[PDB]
Amino acid sequence: QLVESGGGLVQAGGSLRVSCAASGRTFSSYSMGWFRQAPGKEREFVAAISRSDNSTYYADSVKGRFTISRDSAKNTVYLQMNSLKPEDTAVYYCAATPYGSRYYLRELREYDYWGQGTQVTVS
Numbered sequence: 001q002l003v004e005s006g007g008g009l010v011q012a013g014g015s016l017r018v019s020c021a022a023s024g025r026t027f028s029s030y031s032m033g034w035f036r037q038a039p040g041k042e043r044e045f046v047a048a049i050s051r052s053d054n055s056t057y058y059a060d061s062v063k064g065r066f067t068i069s070r071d072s073a074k075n076t077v078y079l080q081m082n083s084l085k086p087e088d089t090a091v092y093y094c095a096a097t098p099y100g101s102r103y104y105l106r107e108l109r110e111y112d113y114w115g116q117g118t119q120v121t122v123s
Contacts, residue, residue, distance in 0.1 A: 004094050007118035016081045018118050020094030024075045030113070031097050031105055032077040034068065036090035037117075045106045046092065049077060052100030059106070062088070084122045091117040 006018040020032065033048035045059045049068045056068045062081075069078045079092065095111035097104060104110045 002094050002096060002113055002115040004092065004115045004118040007092065007120050009121045009123065010084055011123050012084060012086055014084050014122075016084060016120060018079045018081070018092055018120065019076050020079075020115055021074065021076045022096070026096070027072065027075045029098065031100055032068075032070075033095045033097060033105055033111060034079045035093045035095060035108060035111075036120075037093075038087070038090040041090075043093070043108065045108065047079060048097075048105035050100045050102065050105060055102070057102050057105050081120070084120075086122050089120065089122045091119050093117045 001023045002020055004020050010016045031048060031051045034046040035043050036046050037043040046062055047058045047066055047068045049056050049070055065083050067080045094115040096113040097111045
C-alpha cells in the first residue's frame with residue numbers, strides 16, 4: 001500500500017518536496033520509483049531508488065534538478081524538486097518494484113504497486 005503527499009502550486013524556478021509512504025513490512029523488499037503524467041501525455045519515468053544499495057536513477061529531463069531520498073524509520077521516500085520548470089507540471093505517482101537493478105527501475109512495465117498520484121503545478 002502506497003500513499004503520496006506534498007503536492008500543490010509552485011512558482012517557476014522554485015523547489016518542492018513530495019513524499020510516498022509504504023506498508024512498513026514491505027519497505028526492504030521493493031525499490032521505489034516516481035513516474036509522472038503531464039496534461040495529455042503518456043505517463044513517464046522520473047526517478048527511482050534501488051533496494052539493493054540505495055543508489056538513485058533519474059530521467060534525462062530531470063537529472064541534476066530532482067533527487068530521491070529515504071527515511072527507513074518513517075517507511076517513506078522523498079522526491080525533492082529544485083529549479084522547477086513549467087514542463088514539470090504533472091501528476092506524480094509513486095510505485096514499488098521487487099527488482100533492484102537500475103535497468104528495471106526505469107521501466108513502467110516492471111512496477112507492481114502504485115500510489116494514487118499527487119498534482120504538482122508549476123506557474
